[PDB]
Ligand binder design. Structure first.
Ligand code: HEC
Ligand code: HEC
Ligand code: HEC
Ligand code: HEC
Ligand code: ZN
Ligand code: ZN
Ligand code: ZN
Length: 91
């Protein structure tokens, strides 16, 4: 049993949880503002998240309409050094 991350959110909050009047914005800014309003800012999150504050929006990693709940983003589309989440979060 699988659910897209967008549907997981919309089942509780509507499409409007992320989209003004349920309609996407051209630049993703309204959506990013909504993610941060609920979840906090990148700068307030863990070591995978913090360094992306000022360079990415959430959706650059969490493709909410194409990823299921539980799926973890990986790093290779922007980093060519083979890094992993664990290499930043495990000591
Ligand atoms: C936040 C968790 C979201 C919810 C809930 C819904 N959508 Fe969304 N949508 C979201 C983002 C961050 C983006 C842009 C980046 C991306 O991943 O695509 C979108 C994009 C759309 C689009 C444009 C087409 C596309 O790029 O996929 C549409 C038409 C759209 N979203 C519609 C939509 C509907 C109808 C929703 C409720 C059922 C819905 N979205 C929920 C973020 C989120
Ligand atoms: C509030 C109205 C929210 C907005 C806007 C967005 N999210 Fe969210 N998210 C919300 C809740 C209440 C939860 C459940 C928390 C939990 O215990 O899981 C979530 C969950 C997620 C998750 C993880 C889901 C899981 O794997 O368990 C992700 C990755 C996530 N949210 C991302 C996300 C993004 C990218 C958003 C904007 C595009 C976003 N969320 C909006 C509440 C709300
Ligand atoms: C890639 C560079 C990311 C960006 C930008 C954001 N997220 Fe993320 N997120 C990413 C990974 C690889 C993971 C799994 C490993 C980890 O560090 O936990 C996550 C995880 C989450 C979670 C779940 C946290 C948990 O349950 O332990 C949530 C709720 C989440 N991410 C939300 C979120 C939001 C709201 C973002 C923008 C503000 C965001 N993420 C950016 C990768 C990346
Ligand atoms: C693009 C969409 C990215 C994805 C996917 C991931 N990262 Fe990233 N990261 C990105 C940028 C634009 C930057 C700043 C410029 C640069 O590449 O240096 C970063 C930076 C980091 C850093 C700071 C250290 C450094 O690389 O200089 C860390 C620790 C980091 N990123 C970790 C990381 C991880 C673990 C990812 C996958 C889970 C990941 N990034 C994905 C853009 C993007
Ligand atoms: Zn959860
Ligand atoms: Zn770098
Ligand atoms: Zn490199």
């Amino acid at each position: 049993a699988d659910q897209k991350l967008s549907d997981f959110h919309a089942e509780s909050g509507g499409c409007e949880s992320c989209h003004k009047d349920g309609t996407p914005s051209a630049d993703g800014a309204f959506e990013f503002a909504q993610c941060q309003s609920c979840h906090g800012k990148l700068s307030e999150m863990d070591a995978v998240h913090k360094p992306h504050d000022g360079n990415l929006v959430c959706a650059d990693c969490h493709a909410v309409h194409d990823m299921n709940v539980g799926q973890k983003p990986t790093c290779e589309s922007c980093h060519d050094d083979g890094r992993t989440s664990a290499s930043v979060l495990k000591k």
